[PDB]
Amino acid sequence: KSRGKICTIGIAPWGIVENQEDLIGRDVVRPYQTMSNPMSKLTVLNSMHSHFILADNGTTGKYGAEVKLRRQLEKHISLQK
Amino acid sequence: ISKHTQLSPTDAFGTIEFQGGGHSNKAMYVRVSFDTKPDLLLHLMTKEWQLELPKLLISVHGGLQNFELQPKLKQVFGKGLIKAAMTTGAWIFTGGVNTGVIRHVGDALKDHASKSRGKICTIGIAPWGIVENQEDLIGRDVVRPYQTMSNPMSKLTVLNSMHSHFILADNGTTGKYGAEVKLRRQLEKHISLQKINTRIGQGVPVVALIVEGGPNVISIVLEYLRDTPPVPVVVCDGSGRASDILAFGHKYSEVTIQKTFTYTRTQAQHLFIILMECMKKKELITVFRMGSEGHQDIDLAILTALLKGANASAPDQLSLALAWNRVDIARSQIFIYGQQWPVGSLEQAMLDALVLDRVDFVKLLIENGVSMHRFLTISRLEELYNTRHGPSNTLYHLVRDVKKGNLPPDYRISLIDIGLVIEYLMGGAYRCNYTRKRFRTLYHNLNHFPFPFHELMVWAVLMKRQKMALFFWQHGEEAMAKALVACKLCKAMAHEASENDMVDDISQELNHNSRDFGQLAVELLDQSYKQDEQLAMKLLTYELKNWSNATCLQLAVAAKHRDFIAHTCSQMLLTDMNKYLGPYVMMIGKMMIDLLIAVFNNTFFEVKSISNQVWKFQRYQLIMTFHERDYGLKLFITDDELKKVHDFEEQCIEEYFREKDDRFNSSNDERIRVTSERVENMSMRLEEVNEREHS
Numbered sequence: 223k224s225r226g227k228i229c230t231i232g233i234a235p236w237g238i239v240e241n242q243e244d245l246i247g248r249d250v251v252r253p254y255q256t257m258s259n260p261m262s263k264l265t266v267l268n269s270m271h272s273h274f275i276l277a278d279n280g281t282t283g284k285y286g287a288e289v290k291l292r293r294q295l296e297k298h299i300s301l302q303k
Numbered sequence: 304i305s306k307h308t309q310l311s312p313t314d315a316f317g318t319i320e321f322q323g324g325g326h327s328n329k330a331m332y333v334r335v336s337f338d339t340k341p342d343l344l345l346h347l348m349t350k351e352w353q354l355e356l357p358k359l360l361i362s363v364h365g366g367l368q369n370f371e372l373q374p375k376l377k378q379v380f381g382k383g384l385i386k387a388a389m390t391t392g393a394w395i396f397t398g399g400v401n402t403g404v405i406r407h408v409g410d411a412l413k414d415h416a417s418k419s420r421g422k423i424c425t426i427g428i429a430p431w432g433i434v435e436n437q438e439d440l441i442g443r444d445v446v447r448p449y450q451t452m453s454n455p456m457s458k459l460t461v462l463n464s465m466h467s468h469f470i471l472a473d474n475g476t477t478g479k480y481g482a483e484v485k486l487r488r489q490l491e492k493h494i495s496l497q498k499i500n501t502r503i504g505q506g507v508p509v510v511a512l513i514v515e516g517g518p519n520v521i522s523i524v525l526e527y528l529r530d531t532p533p534v535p536v537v538v539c540d541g542s543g544r545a546s547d548i549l550a551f552g553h554k555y556s557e558v559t560i561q562k563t564f565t566y567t568r569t570q571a572q573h574l575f576i577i578l579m580e581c582m583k584k585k586e587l588i589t590v591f592r593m594g595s596e597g598h599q600d601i602d603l604a605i606l607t608a609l610l611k612g613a614n615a616s617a618p619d620q621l622s623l624a625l626a627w628n629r630v631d632i633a634r635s636q637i638f639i640y641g642q643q644w645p646v647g648s649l650e651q652a653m654l655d656a657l658v659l660d661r662v663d664f665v666k667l668l669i670e671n672g673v674s675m676h677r678f679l680t681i682s683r684l685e686e687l688y689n690t691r692h693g694p695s696n697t698l699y700h701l702v703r704d705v706k707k708g709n710l711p712p713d714y715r716i717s718l719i720d721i722g723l724v725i726e727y728l729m730g731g732a733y734r735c736n737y738t739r740k741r742f743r744t745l746y747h748n749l750n751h752f753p754f755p756f757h758e759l760m761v762w763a764v765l766m767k768r769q770k771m772a773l774f775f776w777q778h779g780e781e782a783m784a785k786a787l788v789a790c791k792l793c794k795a796m797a798h799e800a801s802e803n804d805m806v807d808d809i810s811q812e813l814n815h816n817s818r819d820f821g822q823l824a825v826e827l828l829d830q831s832y833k834q835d836e837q838l839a840m841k842l843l844t845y846e847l848k849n850w851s852n853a854t855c856l857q858l859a860v861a862a863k864h865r866d867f868i869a870h871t872c873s874q875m876l877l878t879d880m881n882k883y884l885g886p887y888v889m890m891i892g893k894m895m896i897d898l899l900i901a902v903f904n905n906t907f908f909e910v911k912s913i914s915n916q917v918w919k920f921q922r923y924q925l926i927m928t929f930h931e932r933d934y935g936l937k938l939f940i941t942d943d944e945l946k947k948v949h950d951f952e953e954q955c956i957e958e959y960f961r962e963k964d965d966r967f968n969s970s971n972d973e974r975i976r977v978t979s980e981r982v983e984n985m986s987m988r989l990e991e992v993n994e995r996e997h998s
Contacts, residue, residue: 225961257672260643 230272233292237282240264308475310336315440315471321464323451326416328464332440334431334471337486341493344470352468354424358626359393359609360494362487362511362527362534364520365404366544367480372407372514376541376593381411383601384512388423389415390602391627396487399427399469400434400460404514412465424467428483428490431471435459488526495532501626501655503619508609512537515544518567521577524549528584535612537604538590549581550590556582587612594991606632618648625656630663638671649673654683658690662770679755681718681746687762689716696767697800697809701727719746725761728795729788730861734851754849760785764792767809769816776823780949782956783831783842784850786824787858793817794862821864830959831952832872838951839872840879844938845945854937856923865920874919877926880935886918 236242240262245252258266264283267274279287316333331352335344348354387393398405405427412425431437435457439447453461459478462469472483495507511527513520513536527534538546538553548564562578563570581588589608591598598604606629610620617637624633653673656664669675703710705724722737736742752758756779763772776785797813831839843855850858856876859867867873893910894903933939940948967973 225958255672255674260641 232271232274235288236276236278317444319447319449321449321451324464330466331468334473337474341490357392357394360507360509361395363397364516366515369402373541385415387602394424399429399462401463409463409465427466427469428487430482431473432477435461501622503622514539515542533587535587535608540592552582675755764789783827786820787862790817790820791862830955834955845940846937868920886914889914
């Protein structure tokens with residue numbers, strides 16, 4: 223519809239997505255494929271996102287490891303002036 | 304007799320002009336024998352009448368009584384029927400006499416005659432012994448003026464006009480029906496066998512629309528359901544015949560006393576078993592309710608029954624939709640959550656949409672996670688260049704010319720020949736990507752195409768699919784150089800078409816396309832100069848390895864785009880590389896052709912403007928001649944700055960398109976049109992709202 227940019231911050235655990243690989247190289251624009259196969263029980267990252275933040279957990283494809291980091295980030299931003 | 308007839312040959316065929324109608328309608332009449340096999344009938348239809356198979360076969364059934372329907376239903380039904388028949392290739396099979404729903408559909412076809420162009424295949428399977436004028440038909444291969452006005456005392460209904468063709472069912476009976484029904488059924492059987500041009504393996508998708516009808520039509524829909532491939536059936540709620548009672552029974556199907564309505568011979572008559580079987584096979588039955596139930600579009604009601612009626616596979620459904628050329632159906636009916644598309648189906652669908660110019664389908668496929676980088680193969684490219692199933696173009700003749708006219712039949716086209724053709728079209732200074740030695744080494748021993756959109760646009764220009772080229776033009780990078788190359792190619796092809804034995808429409812069409820490309824390039828340069836002037840200048844300067852190591856300025860001058868050079872930012876590139884008397888000299892050059900004080904006065908403005916533009920155009924040629932490529936012609940760039948240039952160009956063209964859309968949607972005329980259509984629909988809907996009076 224219109225121009226402009228919106229800061230979208232994707233805070234999810236690192237092991238959830240299927241393309242945990244193909245994103246290991248640093249400082250290189252790594253293309254991502256948004257077409258998701260139906261067989262996989264792993265969910266790709268939603269598109270139209272400005273910024274991604276991945277919380278590596280040690281395990282792969284589980285929840286309950288990004289809630290605390292996001293909550294503390296919210297507290298940190300509340301601490302900001 | 305116990306049906307003992309004499310088997311004589313026929314003597315009546317051709318076309319009859321129906322006098323008494325207000326519109327011209329010439330129908331191909333042929334009387335045949337019911338003993339004949341459907342194969343000969345199909346051969347006659349495809350050869351003696353020259354009709355290609357449709358993407359939909361429609362069976363029509365109605366009551367033999369010439370009844371009338373409820374108004375405000377016939378209009379919308381006729382509109383939906385016309386849209387269904389016209390938007391996709393479909394045939395219609397009817398009786399043909401002015402009785403029952405045949406009158407309604409003939410009037411509906413009359414309505415389309417005052418609405419738009421085109422012809423619709425209408426076939427009337429009428430028994431030969433029932434029409435009033437069984438005479439006035441002795442002639443064969445002749446035009447028989449038929450009078451449309453008849454009288455009830457004849458008791459023999461004349462044929463309704465507005466039919467594309469006609470078939471007269473001759474078996475031997477006079478004044479009694481029941482001869483063409485078997486032949487029509489076997490014709491549907493045989494036609495449904497025939498393979499459609501798609502590679503799925505589909506026959507003819509056939510549906511039957513049921514309005515009114517009679518107790519026989521109950522057996523007919525019984526047969527339709529019980530066909531190996533159950534032929535779905537569409538019903539209308541406003542009929543009032545057993546079709547309406549079949550809608551009632553289908554409503555809240557599997558309390559038995561509501562069947563009785565005395566419409567037949569008492570409660571002693573009972574179609575209980577038949578009604579039970581019909582409502583048992585209700586899954587493929589679909590009805591239409593006027594506003595009380597959804598799918599208000601007749602076309603949508605049919606199309607949904609067309610697709611899900613056979614429970615076809617999703618790639619097969621998409622292929623049928625692609626054939627029907629209805630992107631809305633694929634978007635809505637097909638594309639929903641969890642469509643479980645199989646592997647590799649999407650690329651094949653993209654190929655088939657590319658070979659059939661179904662551009663909206665291509666856009667939809669792109670929206671569905673399809674990447675041209677991951678799609679195109681050398682084989683795919685050759686297939687695109689080696690197809691005949693689309694618009695024609697002079698390309699093959701040019702190929703013959705380049706190959707020095709030593710052609711073999713059905714030659715398998717190589718892309719090296721295409722590159723040589725491109726070099727031939729552009730010029731000697733041009734250097735094709737295919738002519739590079741590495742390309743030859745890679746190809747004859749037979750990984751990917753880094754910028755597929757470039758060759759896609761080239762192919763679209765070459766094979767003359769203007770809409771595809773327009774679509775692909777707003778994608779990728781280097782759009783200005785793309786437009787310049789396209790304009791130059793279109794001009795070269797226009798000259799080639801005019802110089803050769805062509806209908807000369809090709810040349811002017813190519814001129815139109817080239818002018819559009821030049822206009823787009825000029826507007827893109829305007830946008831760039833609007834955004835940042837130094838960056839706009841830098842855009843023209845740098846070389847293009849992908850484009851024969853050329854630059855935008857050199858191509859544009861080679862493209863003879865004087866208007867491009869007349870742009871403000873173009874001149875200051877020549878400044879960084881006489882303003883009054885120089886333009887005055889060329890004015891004198893055009894004044895040599897010729898009271899004359901007045902004559903010279905009235906021919907001053909246009910000459911002045913043309914002279915100014917010509918001088919501004921040839922400034923570059925003068926400066927290059929004076930100067931004669933680290934600078935002056937080119938500017939070798941680093942990768943990072945080139946990436947910045949690409950991002951700048953893409954952002955600029957996106958902004959330009961968005962601004963164009965904003966200007967278009969802010970024009971007064973568009974607002975007036977949209978508001979008027981909204982007001983019309985709102986008025987009709989408010990009449991609907993006011994219709995219900997609960998008090």
